[PDB]
Design an enzyme around this catalytic site. Structure first.
Site, short mmCIF file in Angstrom:
data_model
loop_
_atom_site.label_atom_id
_atom_site.label_comp_id
_atom_site.label_asym_id
_atom_site.label_seq_id
_atom_site.Cartn_x
_atom_site.Cartn_y
_atom_site.Cartn_z
N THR A 268 0.83 -1.20 0.00
CA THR A 268 0.00 0.00 0.00
C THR A 268 0.86 1.25 0.00
OG1 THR A 268 -0.15 -0.36 2.35
CG2 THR A 268 -2.09 -0.92 1.05
N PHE A 393 -7.91 4.87 4.73
CA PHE A 393 -7.39 4.03 5.82
C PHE A 393 -8.50 3.28 6.55
CE2 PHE A 393 -4.06 7.25 5.28
CZ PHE A 393 -3.01 6.38 5.01
N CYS A 400 -6.85 1.45 9.65
CA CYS A 400 -5.45 1.04 9.58
C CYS A 400 -4.66 1.42 10.80
CB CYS A 400 -4.86 1.75 8.34
SG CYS A 400 -3.11 1.39 8.10
#
Ligand code: HEM
EC number: 1.14.14.1
Length: 455
Positions: A268, A393, A400
């Protein structure tokens, strides 16, 4: 009122499955979303989910009292190697909350003060690589960003050097990891998963899973034997205790957390840096403004933590790259109880929703009609962003955990890139987005011209 939702084309008992038999399934879903609207039904044999593209519906999906993180088929498949690490656990599994409570302070923005020197170590290696290219050469952008992010997580994760800038041939660990990920995603498209044909596939899978565990298992085991203490997450996991249960993580779960850090954050973050540089070279005025800030702020051979915090426009560049091409482009939710979404779509306890983040980020009732344009100044005033409009996120307690780490790394690296080189889109590159677990601009290449500033 109660509305029936649309559904793309079906193929008998295969349902919509054939529509994702493509190398770019998320991009194919974005087109279907374009054609069908803010919500559509997608079925596979034995499974149903509803794909969401509007802020109006996704904000409801993000209400934690109503919806919780779901392990999608993809996450269930990745679980074969990531186990009950944070990314592939149910919220209600005991090792989710234990690991979460132990690791959250280690991922705070304050904690980045601690990781900064190691991040600078790999960033310097990147810059020196580029400083040392011959005039006839070029940079392979996603490849070099991936060397950087893998090496940074290894070093801050468990004080291990992959030394990716010393080799083209990936660490055997990296080889097996990438290959296990490819197999997990490839599995999502198979109608007959048990045909003998896939039998050697299954074979390589277990060998890959063994490469990964034995490295990580041995690393944990050696650290415990030596008793060394370092500025890494592994030290934290061996000494930490969950205040709620009073328990520490066992060694198997620590291994799953380390495997998880490598998978979930490497691709990512490298994809974010790759897209950010793409957009900068396609928008020379934006590149100029960013490089001027980098020159203004990064006044030392070595950037400090505090300087990185001052790269506000670089930060905006990154968030706008995340808006257009969020590199973990979808996340899955389930309804905790029967509920009606947006006053129109009744859901039963257990039903799955999929948030299509690239589509969310193109909602013109939120961002205006120029949504396809790269405009970092959209982020100049954060408060102007409605809640749940920007979600690269993920959401809530299942958001995240690596967000501060990823943005500190990306801000530092892009800041140094812009300080030290001018960039040329020498091939007039045509955006081509490759899909794995994540999204990245395949074949993206540039030439750099050094500004001759020493480190
Ligand atoms: C720009 C980079 C990144 C993006 C866009 C990103 C995106 C996300 C998203 C979308 C989720 C939620 C997934 C879901 O709901 O199923 C998530 C989960 C997670 N990410 Fe990241 N990630 C990034 C970087 C990182 C890094 C650098 C690390 C680690 C060093 C990391 C570790 C994790 C973990 C552990 C989870 C699970 C959190 C939990 O459920 O407790 N990510 N990430």
């Amino acid at each position: 009122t109660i509305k029936e939702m649309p559904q793309p084309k079906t193929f008998g008992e295969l349902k919509n499955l054939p529509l994702l038999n493509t190398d770019k399934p998320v991009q194919a879903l974005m087109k279907i979303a374009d054609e069908l609207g803010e919500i559509f039904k997608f079925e596979a044999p034995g499974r149903v989910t509803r794909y969401l593209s509007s802020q109006r519906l996704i904000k409801e999906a993000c209400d934690e009292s109503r919806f919780d993180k779901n392990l999608s088929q993809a996450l269930k498949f990745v679980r074969d190697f990531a186990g009950d690490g944070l990314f592939t656990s149910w919220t209600h599994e005991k090792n989710w909350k234990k690991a979460h409570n132990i690791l959250l302070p280690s991922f705070s923005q304050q904690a980045m003060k601690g990781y900064h020197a190691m991040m600078v170590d790999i960033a310097v290696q990147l810059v020196q690589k580029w400083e040392r290219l011959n005039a006839d050469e070029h940079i392979e952008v996603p490849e070099d960003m991936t060397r950087l992010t893998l090496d940074t997580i290894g070093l801050c994760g468990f004080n291990y050097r992959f030394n990716s800038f010393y080799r083209d041939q990936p660490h055997p660990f990296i080889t097996s990891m990438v290959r296990a990920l490819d197999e997990a995603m490839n599995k999502l498209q198979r109608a007959n998963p048990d045909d003998p044909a896939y039998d050697e596939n299954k074979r390589q899978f277990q060998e890959d899973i063994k490469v990964m565990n034995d490295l990580v298992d041995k690393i944990i085991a050696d650290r415990k034997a030596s008793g060394e203490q370092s500025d890494d997450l592994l030290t934290h996991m061996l000494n930490g205790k969950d205040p709620e249960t009073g328990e520490p993580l066992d060694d198997e779960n620590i291994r799953y957390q380390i495997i998880t850090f490598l998978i979930a954050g490497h691709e990512t973050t490298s994809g974010l840096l790759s897209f950010a540089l793409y957009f900068l070279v396609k928008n020379p005025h934006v590149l100029q403004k960013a490089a001027e800030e980098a020159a203004r702020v990064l006044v030392d051979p070595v950037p400090s933590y505090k300087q990185v915090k001052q790269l506000k426009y670089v930060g905006m560049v990154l968030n706008e790259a995340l808006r257009l091409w969020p590199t973990a482009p979808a996340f899955s939710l389930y309804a905790k109880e029967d509920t009606v979404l947006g006053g129109e779509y009744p859901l039963e306890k257990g039903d799955e929703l999929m948030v299509l983040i690239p589509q969310l980020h193109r909602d013109k009732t939120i961002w205006g009609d120029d949504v396809e344009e790269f405009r970092p100044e959209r982020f100049e005033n954060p408060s102007a962003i409605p809640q749940h409009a920007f979600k690269p996120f993920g959401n809530g307690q299942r958001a995240c955990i690596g967000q501060q780490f990823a943005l500190h790394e990306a801000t530092l690296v892009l800041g140094m890139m812009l300080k030290h080189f001018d960039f040329e889109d020498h091939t007039n590159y045509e955006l081509d987005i490759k899909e794995t677990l994540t999204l990245k601009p395949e074949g993206f290449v540039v030439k750099a011209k050094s500004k001759k500033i020493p480190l």
